[PDB]
Amino acid sequence: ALFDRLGRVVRANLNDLVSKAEDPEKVLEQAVIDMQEDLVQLRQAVARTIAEEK
Amino acid sequence: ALFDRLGRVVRANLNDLVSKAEDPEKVLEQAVIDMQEDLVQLRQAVARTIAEEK
Amino acid sequence: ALFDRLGRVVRANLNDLVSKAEDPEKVLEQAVIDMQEDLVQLRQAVARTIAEEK
Amino acid sequence: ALFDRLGRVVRANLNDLVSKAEDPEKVLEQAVIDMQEDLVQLRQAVARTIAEEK
Amino acid sequence: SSATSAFERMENKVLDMEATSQAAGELAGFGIENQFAQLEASSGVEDELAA
Amino acid sequence: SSATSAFERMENKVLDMEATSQAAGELAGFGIENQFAQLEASSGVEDELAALK
Amino acid sequence: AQQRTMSENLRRNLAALEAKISEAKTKKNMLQARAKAAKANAELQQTLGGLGT
Amino acid sequence: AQQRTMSENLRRNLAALEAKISEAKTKKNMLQARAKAAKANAELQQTLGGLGT
Amino acid sequence: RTEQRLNQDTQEAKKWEDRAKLALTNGEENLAREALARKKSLTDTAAAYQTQL
Amino acid sequence: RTEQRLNQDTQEAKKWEDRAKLALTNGEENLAREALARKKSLTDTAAAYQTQL
Amino acid sequence: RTEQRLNQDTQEAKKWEDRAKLALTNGEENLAREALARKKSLTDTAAAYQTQL
Numbered sequence A, B, C, D: 001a002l003f004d005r006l007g008r009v010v011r012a013n014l015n016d017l018v019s020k021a022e023d024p025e026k027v028l029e030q031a032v033i034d035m036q037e038d039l040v041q042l043r044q045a046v047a048r049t050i051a052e053e054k
Numbered sequence E: 001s002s003a004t005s006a007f008e009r010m011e012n013k014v015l016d017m018e019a020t021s022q023a024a025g026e027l028a029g030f031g032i033e034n035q036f037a038q039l040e041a042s043s044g045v046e047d048e049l050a051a
Numbered sequence F: 001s002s003a004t005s006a007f008e009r010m011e012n013k014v015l016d017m018e019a020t021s022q023a024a025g026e027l028a029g030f031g032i033e034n035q036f037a038q039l040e041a042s043s044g045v046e047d048e049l050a051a052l053k
Numbered sequence G, H: 001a002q003q004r005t006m007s008e009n010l011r012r013n014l015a016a017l018e019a020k021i022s023e024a025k026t027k028k029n030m031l032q033a034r035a036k037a038a039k040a041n042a043e044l045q046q047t048l049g050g051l052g053t
Numbered sequence I, J, K: 001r002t003e004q005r006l007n008q009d010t011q012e013a014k015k016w017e018d019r020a021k022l023a024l025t026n027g028e029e030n031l032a033r034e035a036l037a038r039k040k041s042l043t044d045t046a047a048a049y050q051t052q053l
């Protein structure tokens, strides 16, 4: 229990330190960029299943 | 038995120290993450179970 | 108890010294700043409370 | 209390030293420059929400 | 990386000069009322006269 | 070591902090309800006078 | 038939536990809000209070 | 027939994905603008605020 | 400065009076009551300023 | 500059004033209301400028 | 100094005394008593001050 609680304290503190140092606006922007990229890849992927259908 | 009582006292003191180091905003959130992480694994098991049925 | 009385005398003298070092024009103003700083934090809590309601 | 009062004396003195050394006319001017810049940025920002509306 | 958090940061930044929401709400109400209150009234009468 | 027990500890901690704030307010000099009640009566008679005219 | 019987047991359990987690998540948010509120309330009462030096 | 209905489902997921992304972009930009409005407001609170320099 | 604050608060109170009577006339009584509360709040604030002046 | 701002809004206000008058003469209520509201907005802005001036 | 505080306590005592009349009219024994008690505290301080003066 002692070290299990220790882990919880440590993980929580670390996640907050990462969040603090990090700039969420850049990350949000980056997330949208990545989603857009995945979307493009899926469109190509869909196109290949269409091609196989044909 | 004094050794065991001593151990109990030490463990209680350590438990109090780590309890104090807790901060609700980080810790409460951290608990939800854990429950989420665990759920993802159970779903994957159900995923396989469904696949086998099929 | 003479030790405690001595401590009291010393603390009173130090309190008088720091009281004397005060200058109302700077200090009064400084007090308002503090009350303002504190208010900004309480408002942010209310900000979150409202967001959650929504 | 002693050191809490000490802090108040020190912060008040420091803010006044900063104010004294500083030239408020340049700061006022600079403030207006910054407000104007923010205004321009908001106008662009508004334009993007208009663009998305369209 | 989440939009929900992005909202929260913005929402909090505003709470720098108030946003109890009782502001905009009450305000807008009276605004819309008073305006359309007369607007419609004066016009309708005025039209018939002019004809 | 369970997440739920960690959650429960913090839930209680927050509730205690709320209770602390309530008590602190009362010790500081709780008014509110005071002002609110007088504002209510004042607005009451004010509505009556407005309604009258 | 056996596969179906057992995979249905898991689905009920998935649903119950999902419900339990989701409760905790929505509670997490409001408790966080509450914690912040309580913290601020205590700080203001001490600062605005005449008590202390 | 099998490949077609598989593809149709995949196509539906694609449409859903695209719609969500569109929404996220809209939300992202309004938030940047709202953030900027808040920043600007804060600077006006500074200049048209209390006493200082 | 006190004079300016006093006059400003007096003017806003007159606006909220007007607003209350307009709302009441339209048949939006709840809004009028609310308006009368805002009127009262500003009347009190202005009064404090008057004595202060 | 303040004078020019006042006059600019007065000039635009007269355009929507006249449009409203033509609309009122024709008996076209909707057009009259639109133009009138625009005129009203510009004249309120002009008033603010006049006071500033 | 003593004169300033004393003359202030006497005025404040009124604020409390008049509020007690209102509380009874509102239908509340409890805050009426509290209002009376707060009136007493200032009355007692003022008494002490006048003698000291």
Ligand SMILES: Nc1ncnc2c1ncn2[C@@H]1O[C@H](COP(=O)(O)OP(=O)(O)O)[C@@H](O)[C@H]1O
Residues within 6 Å of the ligand: C029, C032, C033, C036, C037, C039, C040, E016, E017, H045, H046, H049, H050, H051, H052
């Ligand atoms: N003497 C002063 N009076 C008011 N504000 C000041 C003063 N000196 C500095 N400030 C700055 O102006 C802000 C005033 O606090 P704020 O909470 O915005 O005012 P209010 O609580 O009236 O809305 C503070 O953030 C502070 O940095």
